[PDB]
C-alpha cells in the first residue's frame, strides 16, 4: 500500500537504533565494543541476556567483525540482527 | 515494555509468516509470494515488480540452498541487503 508498511518501518527502526548508538564515541558510522554493549543491554534486554563481562562483548565483536577493524559497521550489524532474529524465529 | 529494535525484529518475523503462509509450503516464499511481498510491503524502497524475468532474478539471488523458494534465513539476508542500501540515504 501507500502507507509505510510494518516491514518498511522495521527497517527504518534498524537504521535509527544503529545510528543512535554508533554516533556516541569515535566514528559516528561504526559501533566500537563500547557502543555495541550498550545497544545489546538496552535494546535487546528481552531477547538476549545482559552483558556485564568484558570477555563476552569482545567475543561477540570478534564474531561480528568481518572486515577486521575492531568495530561493527552497519552491514555487520545487519548480520547480527539477522542471527538474533533467526534465533527468536525458531520459537515456532 | 519491549524496545523498538525488538519490535522491528518481531515485525520481520510477522511479515515473513504472513506471506509465506499464503500458498504452498507455509514456511517458505515461492516466487509469487515474494513478488506480492515486495509490491505490497516494500513499495517505497523497491521499484514495483512487473516482469517474471525480475521475479526470477530476485529469487535466484536469494535462494542459497537451491530449492526454488525463500525460507526465513534467506529472507533475513534479503532484508539485510535492502536495509543496508537504504542506510546509504540516511
Amino acid at each position: 500500500g501507500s502507507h509505510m508498511s510494518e516491514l518498511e518501518k522495521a527497517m527504518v527502526a534498524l537504521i535509527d537504533v544503529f545510528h543512535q548508538y554508533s554516533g556516541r564515541e569515535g566514528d559516528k558510522h561504526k559501533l566500537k565494543k563500547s557502543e555495541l554493549k550498550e545497544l545489546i543491554n538496552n535494546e535487546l534486554s528481552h531477547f538476549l541476556e545482559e552483558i556485564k563481562e568484558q570477555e563476552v562483548v569482545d567475543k561477540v565483536m570478534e564474531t561480528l567483525d568481518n572486515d577486521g577493524d575492531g568495530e561493527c559497521d552497519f552491514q555487520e550489524f545487519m548480520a547480527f540482527v539477522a542471527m538474533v532474529t533467526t534465533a527468536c524465529h525458531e520459537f515456532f | 515494555h519491549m524496545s523498538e529494535l525488538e519490535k522491528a525484529m518481531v515485525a520481520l518475523i510477522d511479515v515473513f509468516h504472513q506471506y509465506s503462509g499464503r500458498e504452498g509450503d507455509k514456511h517458505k516464499l515461492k516466487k509469487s509470494e515474494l513478488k506480492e511481498l515486495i509490491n505490497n510491503e516494500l513499495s517505497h524502497f523497491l521499484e514495483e515488480i512487473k516482469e517474471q524475468e525480475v521475479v526470477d532474478k530476485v529469487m535466484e539471488t536469494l535462494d542459497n540452498d537451491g530449492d526454488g523458494e525463500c525460507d526465513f534465513q534467506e529472507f533475513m539476508a534479503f532484508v539485510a541487503m535492502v536495509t543496508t542500501a537504504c542506510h546509504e540515504f540516511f
Binding site: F47, E49, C88 | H44, A85
Partner: peptide, 15 residues
C-alpha cells in the same frame, strides 16, 4: 527513493 534488483550465543526465557 529509490532502488531495484542490485543484490550484493544466548537468547533467554521469553514470550
Amino acid at each position: 527513493a529509490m532502488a531495484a534488483t542490485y543484490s550484493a550465543r544466548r537468547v533467554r526465557k521469553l514470550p
